């Protein structure tokens, strides 16, 4: 129990193992009889010492500390310091808290609830996101078969101590990490470690890449697929290899979601002026020239007139939408903010197998007729067949079909011939399936030609054959067929097909053959040799006795029919969907535990790599590695084997990582995927990781945004990811980077506006001090614009569509190009915020003018204990026009000002609708906005004539003009920025205007 650079940073290493030691040494190390087992007494003696074989979820179950975020949440600080300060107002009262009983106390509880509610949105933005170890610890088996003091007994995996030997049958999960001391035909599936699916085998002895690749170790998560074995627990639970990971890909934390970290840099700037004035006036004004209760009522105002009550709660919605928008196209989202990170994304990291490729051995090509062929390497799509004409294939067809042990399980009615259930193995089922796209059903073809004898698949001696009886009662009555290593097969024939004929083998074709071979091997697909023979009759009469595992019938001078290559093909989309991410300047990289050859050949296959392999020019010229090669780095890309990444330093990676666009590290340990991701991140970037298997877990966390794979993924890989493609359509990454980039913009617009109206809300109280000209705008009135009026329009902005070929610009850097900034503030606080100001300030006067205008008068403290005693401009305003002297601002002015703000907010909510295009040669079809712009303007009126609540609010203004006042202004607005946009344009590079573009 030390620091973190150790408790969760001790995985930058991998090795440290003893399995490359004599059974004697082993036995001695654990002091355990390698066959009688271990003593039960000794058993517990160790469990009560070492501690149960099982994982333990991280200490976490807090459902508050996260809810209670608002206690800093957004602007809830000032709100709290405000609604507490304005909760004091109702206190500092004397002669029976008069009307101030209604006000203050209420504005305190109101601003009070606000904070609370402004939190639920500053909460639903980060739904309880956790539970990895969950699945991991749910991957260990329940029972376990281990040998002790003699017999073999079964018990709870948890009870397996280090040191004893356990037996594992095929189809069970390996109890713990163990070094097999003996086995028989054991084959374990290492998916969850290598990431590859083809079964590996287990030998009691051996050695190799000392720990992970030696055939004498079995791993924690993995499971036995066939055969049997007995080994000795070298590591238990939390201490295993998958334990180290299970722990790592759990206790590790990502951090700040870009978009969500932008919800910071501005929350500060706004909260910067939040006091620069806020307190400034409390001081530079409240100079004992106003009563305490005055300053404070003035304090709690600017507060309210500053924190955009309705805004964060807005972005929340702006997110919620672009989420509930992508989900209709699948690629579900578990964490909102992610949505706008996928757009800020600069680099993508992908698990080749399962993600890019579909992970299913499929026939890639064929060499029937001295000519190459390609097939629908897809998930049933275009390309369509290779031919299917030439009788030659006809033959090859059956071969692959008969010389096969494959089948299907349930009835599988679903036509997904390719998505159906296999039995045998990749190599073979790959073939079976291939012979179902066409040539009817093999099951029937298997019964067409009945099998009488078969020589088991490759038995070290390469090849596999079987003799069936031909029903075509004309030519031979016995057809034997075999396939095996391409080399072997060929070099044991004497004649090969051609459309149907049988020209003899020789030098001529033995060439085009080698070509096809090496020419196919190059693409990195496995190739098999197919051939058959018709055993002559006068040599084998019906009923002839063939001796199974014994020489008896021909083997040489057979007929070579063809070549077939299979591979793990790229998904349908993957091909160009990658290019699209490039179209968008996004860098990619292949992080795979599979082997080099494959990784590269597959990299080239999906654009990940174009022209300029390093180690190739090494041969394509100055036949060497160092020399005029290495240094020159004349190579734009390269393939890095994990074996070497293990011996590299921080900067060493940096170099390799950012000195060329290799896009491919192969054979990598889980940790490595992450250490790789980290390295990408440490260079100030936003990286996303796409995976499927559990080996990704880690990298699917340190990664800014993580993309699982729905079905092609582990019931964990997903638990660690942010996005869950449920159609595995790897193109959604693009239909996600776009939709994300959209909301970045469609948020500024949505935000700029949502606060420009902040100005028209402060100024009143500010002037309200410089020249005691009666509260133009009311506090209880402010909480009714950002949190009541501009609501739907802020939201609306979000729906606003594009503005250009977005996927044409480099990823938005994250250190410079921010969200909120001068460009914005200047153009929304110091420009329009002002013009709006006048407007509603102007209306303030007219609202008094046509009643008792003091364009030169006014400027005076309007007490209320006096009652009548004074007035202005030929009047007697008192108890009658005192209750009333304010009815010109309360029920009025505030109201007309109020409406005027709305009224200016129209042209705002249209000048911010676009960021660079005249609403003219630009869609003005935001159905939502529009029907809201009215749903706003209207509420306004209902809130201005609402027969009752108008008490706790304003009053009946003179419809004919108590509205149009600001109207003269809304225009200038619209007219103003409209020119600049057109200004920004005529002069593209722009000057002061584009310099203060936005």
């Amino acid at each position: 129990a030390k620091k973190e650079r150790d408790m969760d940073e001790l995985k930058k290493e991998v090795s440290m193992d003893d399995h490359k030691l004599s059974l004697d040494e082993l036995h001695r190390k654990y002091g355990t009889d390698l066959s009688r087992g271990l003593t039960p007494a000794r058993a517990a003696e160790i469990l009560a010492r070492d501690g149960p074989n099982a994982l333990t979820p991280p200490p976490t179950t807090p459902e508050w500390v996260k809810f209670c975020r608002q206690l800093f949440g957004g602007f809830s600080m000032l709100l709290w310091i405000g609604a507490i300060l304005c909760f004091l107002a109702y206190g500092i009262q004397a002669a029976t808290e008069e009307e101030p009983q209604n006000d203050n106390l209420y504005l305190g509880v109101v601003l009070s609830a606000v904070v609370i509610i402004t939190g639920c949105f500053s909460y639903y933005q980060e739904a309880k996101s956790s539970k990895i170890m969950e699945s991991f610890k749910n991957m260990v088996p329940q029972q376990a078969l281990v040998i002790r003091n003699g017999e073999k007994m079964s018990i709870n995996a948890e009870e397996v101590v280090v040191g004893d030997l356990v037996e594992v049958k095929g189809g069970d999960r390996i109890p713990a990490d163990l070094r097999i001391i003996s086995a028989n035909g054991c084959k374990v599936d290492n998916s969850s470690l290598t990431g590859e699916s083809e079964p590996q085998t287990r030998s009691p002895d051996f050695t190799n890449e000392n720990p992970l690749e030696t055939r004498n170790i079995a791993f924690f998560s993995t499971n036995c697929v066939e055969g049997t074995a007995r080994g000795i627990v070298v590591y238990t639970g939390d201490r295993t290899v998958m334990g180290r990971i299970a722990t790592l890909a759990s206790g590790l934390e990502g951090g700040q979601t870009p978009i969500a970290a932008e919800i910071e840099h501005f929350i500060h700037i706004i909260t910067g002026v939040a006091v620069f004035l806020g307190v400034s006036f409390f001081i530079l004004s409240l100079i004992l020239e106003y009563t305490w209760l005055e300053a404070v009522i003035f304090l709690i105002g600017i507060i309210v007139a500053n924190v955009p009550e309705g805004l964060l709660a807005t972005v929340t919605v702006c997110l919620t939408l672009t989420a509930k928008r992508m989900a209709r196209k699948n690629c579900l989202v578990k964490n909102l903010e992610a949505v706008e990170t996928l757009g800020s994304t600069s680099t993508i990291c992908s698990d080749k197998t399962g993600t890019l490729t579909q992970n299913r051995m499929t026939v890639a090509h064929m060499w029937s007729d001295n000519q190459i062929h390609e097939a629908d390497t897809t998930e049933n799509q275009s390309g369509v067949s290779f031919d299917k004409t030439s009788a030659t294939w006809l033959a090859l067809s059956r071969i692959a079909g008969l010389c096969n042990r494959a089948v299907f399980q349930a009835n599988q009615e679903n036509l997904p011939i390719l998505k159906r259930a296999v039995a045998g193995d990749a190599s073979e089922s790959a073939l079976l399936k291939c012979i179902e796209l066409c040539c009817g059903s093999v099951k029937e073809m298997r019964e067409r030609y009945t099998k009488i004898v078969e020589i088991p698949f490759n038995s070290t001696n390469k090849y596999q054959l079987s003799i069936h009886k031909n029903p075509n009662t004309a030519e031979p009555r016995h057809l034997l067929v075999m396939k095996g290593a391409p080399e072997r097969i060929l070099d044991r024939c004497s004649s090969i097909l051609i459309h149907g004929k049988e020209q003899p083998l020789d030098e001529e074709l033995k060439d085009a053959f080698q070509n096809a071979y090496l020419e196919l091997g190059g693409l990195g697909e496995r190739v098999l040799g197919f051939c058959h023979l018709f055993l002559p009759d006068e040599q084998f009469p019906e009923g002839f006795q063939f001796d199974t595992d014994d020489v008896n019938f021909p083997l040489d001078n057979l007929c070579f029919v063809g070549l077939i290559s299979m591979i793990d093909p790229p998904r349908a989309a993957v091909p160009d969907a990658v290019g699209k991410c490039r179209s968008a300047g996004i860098k990619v990289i292949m992080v795979t535990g599979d082997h080099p050859i494959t990784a590269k050949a597959i990299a080239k296959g999906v654009g990940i790599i174009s022209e300029g392999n390093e180690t190739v020019e090494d041969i394509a010229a100055r036949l060497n590695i160092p020399v005029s090669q290495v240094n020159p780095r004349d190579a734009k890309a390269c393939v890095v084997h994990g074996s070497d990444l293990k011996d590299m330093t921080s900067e060493q990676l940096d170099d390799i990582l950012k000195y060329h666009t290799e896009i491919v590290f192969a054979r990598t340990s889980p940790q490595q995927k992450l250490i790789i991701v980290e390295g990408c991140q440490r260079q100030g970037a936003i990286v996303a990781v796409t995976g499927d298997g559990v080996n990704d877990s880690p990298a699917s966390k340190k990664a800014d945004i993580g993309v699982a794979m729905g079905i092609a993924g582990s019931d964990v890989s997903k638990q660690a990811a942010d996005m869950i493609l449920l159609d595995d359509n790897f193109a959604s990454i693009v239909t996600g980077v776009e939709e994300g980039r959209l909301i970045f913009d469609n948020l500024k617009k949505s935000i700029a506006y949502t606060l420009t109206s902040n100005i028209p809300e402060i100024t009143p109280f500010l002037i309200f001090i410089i020249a005691n000209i009666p509260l133009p705008l009311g506090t209880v009135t402010i909480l009714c614009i950002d949190l009541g009026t501009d609501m739907v329009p802020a939201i609306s902005l979000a729906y606003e569509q594009a503005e250009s070929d977005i996927m044409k610009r480099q990823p938005r850097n994250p250190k410079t190009d921010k969200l909120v900034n001068e460009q914005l503030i200047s153009m929304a606080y110091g420009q329009i915020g002002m013009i709006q100001a006048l407007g509603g300030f102007f209306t303030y006067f007219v609202i008094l003018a046509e009643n008792g205008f003091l364009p030169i008068h006014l400027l005076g403290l309007r007490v209320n204990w006096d009652d009548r005693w004074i007035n202005d401009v030929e009047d007697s305003y008192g108890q009658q026009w005192t209750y009333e002297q304010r009815k010109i601002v309360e029920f009025t002015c505030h109201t007309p000002f109020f409406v005027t703000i709305v009224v200016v907010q129209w042209a705002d909510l249209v000048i911010c609708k676009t960021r660079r295009n005249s609403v003219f040669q630009q869609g003005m079809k935001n159905k939502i906005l529009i029907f809201g712009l009215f749903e706003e303007t209207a509420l306004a009126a209902f809130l201005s004539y609402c027969p009752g609540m108008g008490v706790a609010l304003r009053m009946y203004p003179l419809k004919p003009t108590w509205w149009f006042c600001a109207f003269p202004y809304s225009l200038l607005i619209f007219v103003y920025d409209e020119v600049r946009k057109l200004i920004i344009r005529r002069r593209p590079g722009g000057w002061v205007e584009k310099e203060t573009y936005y």
């Binding site: 159905k927 939502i928 029907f931 809201g932 009215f934 749903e935 303007t937 209207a938 509420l939 009126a941 209902f942 004539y945 027969p947 009946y956 003179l958 419809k959």
Partner: peptide, 29 residues
């Protein structure tokens, strides 16, 4: 005001009623 009483609100219902009658009408588009 024997005018904008039961008459200034009907005006507050010409662009609101287009909220659950016309905006709710973008599906039959």
């Amino acid at each position: 005001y024997e005018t904008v009483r039961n008459g200034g609100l009907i005006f507050a219902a010409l662009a609101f009623i287009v909220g659950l009658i016309i905006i709710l009408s973008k599906r039959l588009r």
